């Protein structure tokens, strides 16, 4: 029963988020040495790639058992509130420590300075620190999918019409992750609570992400893409 839930969540994450193994990297060299307020160019690709991964997050949510049984209002509410969490967790899972870079789903591989100029700004060091904090957890697709599924199906989100049903769906996910951690890494004693503590870091960063969006609007040349604008605020 719990093995099928783990298999379902892992499958859903693999189908909507390709591993770093399959992606061919490419690198840009502009805006890579000096920090600017915003490199218009990197922002154009960055916003386009985030819009596409937001779409992948909804596909991923629709494959999680029980999510489609919630009202559409609550699904929208959960997705808007977890959007930045899952995006940041995804890009931090694609961090290459030796290069100090992050790779997007199309293969775009940016260093720290380029991440800043693309739109991260003062969030840059926060995100790169979190990506380093994930390294000792040795996370695979199942653990990354389960973490995303737990952040998304959170019964404590505001405006939830049925918080109780959402909490009912989150409990099997948490015990699935606990069981999975016990079987994968029997050496690490307290790996399960430390993974949950990483969700606390992630929710802190993405709360500061919702703040960066406000200042990004006045700096970009135009206005935010439609889907991003709907998800945030």
């Amino acid at each position: 029963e719990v093995g099928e839930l783990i298999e379902k969540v892992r499958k859903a994450h693999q189908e909507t988020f390709p591993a770093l193994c399959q992606l061919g990297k490419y690198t840009t060299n502009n805006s890579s040495e000096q920090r600017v307020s915003l490199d218009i160019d990197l922002w154009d690709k960055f916003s386009e790639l985030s819009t596409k991964c937001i779409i992948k997050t909804v596909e991923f949510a629709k494959q999680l058992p029980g999510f489609t049984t919630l009202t559409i209002a609550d699904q929208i509410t959960l997705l808007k509130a977890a959007c930045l969490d899952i995006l940041i967790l995804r890009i931090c899972t694609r961090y290459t420590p030796e290069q100090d870079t992050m790779t997007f789903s199309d293969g775009l591989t940016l260093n720290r300075t380029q991440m800043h100029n693309a739109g991260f700004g003062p969030l840059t060091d926060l995100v790169f620190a979190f990506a380093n904090q994930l390294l000792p957890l040795e996370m695979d697709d199942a653990e990354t999918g389960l973490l995303s599924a737990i952040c998304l199906i959170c019964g404590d989100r505001q405006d939830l019409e049925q918080p109780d049903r959402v909490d009912m769906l989150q409990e099997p996910l948490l015990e699935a992750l606990k069981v999975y951690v016990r079987k994968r890494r029997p050496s690490r004693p307290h790996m399960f609570p430390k993974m949950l503590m990483k969700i606390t870091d992630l929710r802190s960063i993405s709360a500061k992400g919702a703040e960066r969006v406000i200042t990004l609007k006045m700096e970009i040349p135009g206005s935010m893409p439609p889907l991003i604008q709907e998800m945030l605020e």
Binding site: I76, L227, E230
Partner: peptide
Amino acid sequence: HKILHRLLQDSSSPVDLAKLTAEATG
């Protein structure tokens, strides 16, 4: 909301998806 909605009520289809992606992009 608007776009978000259709993504959730997606008789899903690469054509539908392509349309929503362009709308999502702008």
